[PDB]
Ligand binder design. Structure first.
Ligand SMILES: C[C@H]1c2cccc(O)c2C(=O)C2=C(O)[C@]3(O)C(=O)C(C(N)=O)=C(O)[C@@H](N(C)C)[C@@H]3[C@@H](O)[C@@H]21
Ligand SMILES: C[C@H]1c2cccc(O)c2C(=O)C2=C(O)[C@]3(O)C(=O)C(C(N)=O)=C(O)[C@@H](N(C)C)[C@@H]3[C@@H](O)[C@@H]21
Ligand SMILES: [Cl-]
Ligand SMILES: [Cl-]
Ligand SMILES: [Cl-]
Ligand SMILES: [Cl-]
Ligand SMILES: [Cl-]
Ligand SMILES: [Cl-]
Ligand SMILES: [Cl-]
Ligand SMILES: [Cl-]
Ligand SMILES: [Cl-]
Ligand SMILES: [Cl-]
Ligand SMILES: [Mg+2]
Ligand SMILES: [Mg+2]
Lengths: 198, 198
C-alpha cells in the first residue's frame, strides 16, 4: 500500500493495538502494509526508530491540550494537560510503554519551550517548574501503565478484599483524578513558601 | 544446575540484568540453568508465571522498608516506603516493568494488610488511604521507568537546552525526592480538610 511517513505510522498504530508493544515487529508491519521486508527497510530501519516516531504521532493526533489558554492559571494548565496526556496514552494498547524514555522531538520544540516558559512566568525557577512537569508526567505514566498492563482468592484479609473491590469498580480515572489534585496542591505549597521553612 | 524455586529465581534475575524484560525467554533461561526446555517446563510454565514470581522476589530480597516503625508518622512511612520501593526496582534492569500490573501475592497479604490498616488508624477512609498508596506507587513506578528506559541537537531552544542539562546532571533521584514531598504534602492538605472546602 502507500509508504509515505503518514501511512507507515497509520499501519504501525493499528498493529500496536492488535498485538501490543512486545509483539510489534518490522516483520509483522511489512505483512500488514502488503510489502517485503527489504521494501520496509528503506522507510523504517529498526523497532527503536518506529517506537520514537509512534511516541510523537500519538500526541500529535490525540493530545489536544498541549498549550495554556490566555489567562489560564498554571494549576489549571497542569490539570488540563495531564487529563489530555492520559487520554492520548490510553488511546492505543501499551501507549504509555511507547512514550517511556523518549525526549522532546524537534517537532515538539516550540510547544515544550512554551510550556517551560509559561511555568517560569508564573514564579517557578526553571529547575522547580521542570520538577513539577516531570512529577505530573511520571505520575500519569505510572497510572496508565498499571491500568493498561493489568488488562494484560478465598482467604483475602478483609481490608485488601475491599481495596481490590474499590480498584475493580472503576477503570482507574477516580484514583488518577484524586492523586493529581494532591500533586498540584503540593507544588502550590512549595511555590508559595519561597525561602520560608515549610 | 539446582532447580528448586530459589535457584530458578536466582538465574531468572541474572538473565533479566544481562538481557532486559523483552529479551527474557524460557529458551534463554533453560540455556543459563544448563537444562533442556522440557526440564524447565515442569518447574516454569510460561514467561507470565516467571514475571509474577520475579515481581514478588525482588521486593522480598531488596524492599527492606515494607512496615512502619513503632510511633512512626504516616508521612514518614510513605517517604521511607517509597525510597525503599524505588531502590528495589532500580536493583535489576527493567525491574519496574517486571512489577507493572501485578496485584498483592498471598505471601504479601499480612504485609499489605498491615499497610492499609496503618493508613486507616491515622485517619484515612480505606478509599482515601488506598488513593494515597496508589498515587505514591504510580509516581515511583513512572520515575524508575523513565530513568531505566532512557538508558535503553544544535538548535535546542534555550530553556529546553538547560532543562536537558538539569536532567542529564543527575540519575533522577533529585527530581524524585522533590516530587515525593509535593505528593505527601498534598495528601496531608486533603486529610486535614475533612468536610471543609479546600
Ligand atoms: C518539558 C518537556 C520535557 C523537558 C525536558 C525533558 C523531558 O524529558 C521533557 C518531556 O519528556 C516532556 C514531555 O514528554 C511532555 O509529555 C510533552 O512532550 C508534552 C507535549 N508534547 O505536549 C506535554 O504535554 C508535557 N506534559 C507535562 C505531559 C510534557 C513536557 O512538558 C515535557
Ligand atoms: C496495598 C497494596 C495494594 C492494594 C490494592 C491493590 C494493589 O494493586 C496494591 C499494590 O499493588 C501494592 C503494592 O504493589 C505495594 O508496592 C507493595 O506490595 C508493597 C510491599 N510488598 O511492601 C509496598 O511497599 C507498597 N508501597 C506503597 C510501594 C504497595 C502496597 O501498599 C500496595
Ligand atoms: Cl499492497
Ligand atoms: Cl495504496
Ligand atoms: Cl509509496
Ligand atoms: Cl507523509
Ligand atoms: Cl523487530
Ligand atoms: Cl548443569
Ligand atoms: Cl547444582
Ligand atoms: Cl533440582
Ligand atoms: Cl526453594
Ligand atoms: Cl518465552
Ligand atoms: Mg516525555
Ligand atoms: Mg503493586
Amino acid at each position: 500500500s502507500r509508504l509515505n511517513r503518514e501511512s507507515v505510522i497509520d499501519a504501525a498504530l493499528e498493529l500496536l493495538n492488535e498485538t501490543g508493544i512486545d509483539g510489534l515487529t518490522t516483520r509483522k508491519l511489512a505483512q500488514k502494509l502488503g510489502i517485503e521486508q527489504p521494501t520496509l527497510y528503506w522507510h523504517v530501519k529498526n523497532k527503536r526508530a518506529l517506537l520514537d516516531a509512534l511516541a510523537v504521532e500519538i500526541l500529535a493526533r490525540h493530545h489536544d491540550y498541549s498549550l495554556p489558554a490566555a489567562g489560564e492559571s498554571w494549576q489549571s494548565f497542569l490539570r488540563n494537560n495531564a487529563m489530555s496526556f492520559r487520554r492520548a496514552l490510553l488511546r492505543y494498547r501499551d501507549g504509555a510503554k511507547v512514550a517511556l524514555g523518549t525526549r522532546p522531538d524537534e517537532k515538539q520544540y516550540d510547544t515544550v519551550e512554551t510550556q517551560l516558559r509559561f511555568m517560569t512566568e508564573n514564579g517557578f525557577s526553571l529547575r522547580d517548574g521542570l520538577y513539577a512537569i516531570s512529577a505530573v508526567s511520571h505520575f500519569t505514566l505510572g497510572a496508565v501503565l498499571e491500568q493498561q498492563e493489568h488488562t494484560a482468592d478465598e482467604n483475602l484479609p478483609p481490608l485488601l478484599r475491599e481495596a481490590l473491590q474499590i480498584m475493580d469498580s472503576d477503570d482507574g480515572e477516580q484514583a488518577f483524578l484524586h492523586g493529581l489534585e494532591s500533586l498540584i496542591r503540593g507544588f502550590e505549597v512549595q511555590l508559595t513558601a519561597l525561602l520560608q521553612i515549610v
